[PDB]
Amino acid sequence: PQQINDIVHRTITPLIEQQKIPGMAVAVIYQGKPYYFTWGYADIAKKQPVTQQTLFELGAVSKTFTGVLGGDAIARGEIKLSDPATKYWPELTAKQWNGITLLHLATYTAGGLPLQVPDEVKSSSDLLRFYQNWQPAWAPGTQRLYANSSIGLFGALAVKPSGLSFEQAMQTRVFQPLKLNHTWINVPPPEEKNYAWGYREGKAVHVSPGALDAEAYGVKSTIEDMARWVRSNMNPRDINDKTLQQGIQLAQSRYWQTGDMYQGLGWEMLDWPVNPDSIINAAHPVKAITPPTPAVRASWVHKTGATGGFGSYVAFIPEKELGIVMLANKNYPNPARVAAAWQILNALQ
């Protein structure tokens, strides 16, 4: 439709101009079907265009895949969220770990795990030391503090009973059943040709390696696969792999409330309708939701992400079968991402 084309062009064109974004891809999911748009360049020096096959860094959007994989492992009966972390890493003997559960790791409520795993952590035994030495600020299950060192560790532990590495579990249990055939934790050599450069100060960059990066911020994907990701999370009923279906649902269960947002497994959720104001607006108290509310279809379900050189956003409203993915190769402010996303989806209501 013209409706869609017009709404996207009039919102994204000025965004790209305002933020000087070199390349961008957008998918709009409207009545459950995808509509694709591209602008600019994947690689400026080469004048290589963004296409539907261009790989972008998802940054913290990766957390939605980690949440889902975790859900799938719960649905298989391999783990429960109330399991202590030490059940799956018994070398975590330091006593601040008594009481910290997989839930707390998955939902940033362990008690002040830091935003990043320290740069100096380079090995498993360095990572052990880091967790053994860490002193919580708060008792578990009382404050939400967004942290890569939290959800990162959740992902690493949640796959232990599978007998697979994190990457293998993700590939076989999430990417392949959903036909996400151009989505990668590590871009393989034959796909480097489609891997966009990110731009940070006009300098071409890719995300740096770091501990727990696969789990926390390391996925690369195309606009097509990300449209398929959104569809799959909006209509889990449509998926044949039954544990994956259930795990998708579990990742949208509401475990905690903080202000007007509910924490799922990677996904974050607000009741629909809501404004861009409220979508956008440190540690904050949580309230347990008991039992966790089953996925509420009347929600704005979203996650933002931004590596050094990229900015990404995914949002969807399952009860409307409406959604959007925005992938760019420059990191630009979150309020701008949300405002554009909301303007498009509000117009297609």
Side-chain angles (χ1 to χ4, degrees), residues 1-2 4-349:
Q2 288 306 160
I4 304 194
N5 283 358
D6 291 333
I7 296 156
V8 178
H9 299 321
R10 76 179 206 74
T11 146
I12 300 298
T13 295
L15 176 58
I16 289 169
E17 163 65 29
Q18 179 202 46
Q19 300 298 334
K20 310 287 188 221
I21 288 171
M24 188 145 193
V26 166
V28 174
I29 306 296
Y30 173 80
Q31 290 169 347
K33 299 162 46 147
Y35 297 79
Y36 302 111
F37 303 82
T38 63
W39 298 256
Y41 295 132
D43 178 328
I44 288 168
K46 294 178 69 158
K47 335 196 96 181
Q48 175 178 160
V50 177
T51 71
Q52 289 179 29
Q53 296 91 41
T54 299
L55 296 159
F56 290 85
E57 294 169 6
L58 304 187
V61 172
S62 301
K63 296 174 176 67
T64 64
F65 289 93
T66 297
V68 173
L69 178 62
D72 176 82
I74 297 160
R76 287 165 187 276
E78 290 174 339
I79 59 177
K80 298 191 306 287
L81 299 165
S82 66
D83 287 340
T86 51
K87 177 175 166 155
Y88 298 101
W89 203 2
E91 293 78 5
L92 233 34
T93 55
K95 76 197 190 323
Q96 70 272 28
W97 286 94
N98 296 318
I100 299 185
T101 62
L102 293 187
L103 182 62
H104 295 141
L105 295 176
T107 61
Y108 321 114
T109 50
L113 281 167
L115 181 54
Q116 303 296 352
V117 175
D119 268 16
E120 83 219 309
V121 173
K122 291 277 127 79
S123 70
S124 336
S125 68
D126 291 350
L127 185 67
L128 184 53
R129 175 181 177 276
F130 159 69
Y131 288 121
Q132 291 281 83
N133 287 2
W134 160 74
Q135 283 323 306
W138 311 288
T142 67
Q143 302 283 341
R144 182 184 185 277
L145 178 67
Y146 175 76
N148 295 293
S149 64
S150 188
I151 192 164
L153 187 55
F154 169 70
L157 302 181
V159 303
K160 291 287 173 191
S162 65
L164 304 169
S165 57
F166 186 81
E167 183 178 48
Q168 289 293 307
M170 179 73 78
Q171 277 178 31
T172 54
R173 295 183 165 192
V174 179
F175 292 166
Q176 282 162 19
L178 294 179
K179 305 197 177 207
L180 310 179
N181 292 323
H182 298 83
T183 297
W184 316 102
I185 290 168
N186 295 116
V187 175
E191 296 300 332
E192 298 282 353
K193 66 186 179 192
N194 272 316
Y195 189 4
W197 282 116
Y199 293 93
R200 180 170 183 162
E201 277 268 342
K203 303 196 212 55
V205 291
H206 278 155
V207 65
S208 311
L212 296 174
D213 50 7
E215 292 93 345
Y217 53 85
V219 176
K220 280 70 66 161
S221 191
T222 66
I223 194 72
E224 294 195 358
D225 277 7
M226 292 301 290
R228 211 166 320 109
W229 181 234
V230 170
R231 299 152 80 252
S232 307
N233 278 271
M234 281 216 283
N235 307 308
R237 287 224 128 69
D238 297 320
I239 292 146
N240 278 5
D241 170 342
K242 196 123 126 55
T243 60
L244 184 58
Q245 168 178 316
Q246 294 163 313
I248 285 159
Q249 232 68 66
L250 291 184
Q252 276 174 66
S253 293
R254 297 175 177 194
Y255 297 92
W256 305 102
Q257 181 172 2
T258 314
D260 66 3
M261 176 266 352
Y262 299 90
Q263 189 66 54
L265 304 175
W267 295 113
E268 300 164 0
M269 291 83 62
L270 300 92
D271 291 318
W272 181 256
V274 57
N275 302 160
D277 233 42
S278 307
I279 295 171
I280 303 150
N281 310 299
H284 294 110
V286 291
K287 182 184 136 149
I289 292 155
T290 311
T293 314
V296 170
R297 288 191 78 76
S299 294
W300 174 275
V301 187
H302 77 143
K303 189 69 200 76
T304 201
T307 57
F310 293 76
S312 56
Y313 193 67
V314 175
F316 58 97
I317 304 160
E319 70 174 343
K320 301 187 167 307
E321 298 295 340
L322 200 50
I324 193 173
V325 182
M326 299 156 58
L327 310 173
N329 56 358
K330 182 179 163 183
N331 183 349
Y332 64 100
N334 200 35
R337 308 175 205 150
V338 170
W342 192 86
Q343 175 162 301
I344 290 160
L345 291 195
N346 178 226
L348 293 173
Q349 277 196 102

